[PDB]
């Protein structure tokens, strides 16, 4: 595994709508190689989720790993997933409001509003359809990821 460098604010990369996965990319050592060098950035720099622009990577893959941590002391343990052109289907009108950092953004934590719940539709790596309901913080991580592969970091979204 390889820790890859993470592009910063300001840098133009985080700015793109990252392209979707193509088909012949499905359950291809290419994306796993891509989703493990990605996974060990994320847990290199303490995060609780990881999307491929992140890594200078225009394209549309996300990990979700919500794990207690120094960065996150209080964040409720998931088995981590891996999606691939995640697509969220549902945002709840109910809102919670939390404290959110970013791999890309150094030295700052703002509060950010975001759906309680959200349902997402996305493919495994494999190339498999999973559709699944997510909850509070692991819910914050879904859109706080797929705002990443829009264009969109949290700082946008401080209300
Ligand atoms: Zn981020």
Redo the contacts with the bound molecule.
């Keep these: 595994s390889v820790v890859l460098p993470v592009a910063k604010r300001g840098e133009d990369i985080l700015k793109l709508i990252a392209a979707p996965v193509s088909a012949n990319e499905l359950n291809s050592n290419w994306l796993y190689q891509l989703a493990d060098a990605m996974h060990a950035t994320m847990l290199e720099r303490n995060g609780v989720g990881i999307?491929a622009p992140?890594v200078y990577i225009s394209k549309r893959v996300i990990i979700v790993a919500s794990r207690p941590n120094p960065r996150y002391p209080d964040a409720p343990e998931m088995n981590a997933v891996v999606m691939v052109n995640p697509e969220i289907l549902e945002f709840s009108s109910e809102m919670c409001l939390g404290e959110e950092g970013?791999?890309?953004?150094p030295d700052e934590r703002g509060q950010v509003e975001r759906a309680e719940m959200v349902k997402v539709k996305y493919l495994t790596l494999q190339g498999e359809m999973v559709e699944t309901v997510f909850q509070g913080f692991p819910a914050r991580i879904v859109q706080?990821?797929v705002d990443?592969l829009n264009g969109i970091?949290?700082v946008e979204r401080i209300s």
């Design positions: 999307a992140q970013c791999l890309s953004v706080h990821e990443h970091l949290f």
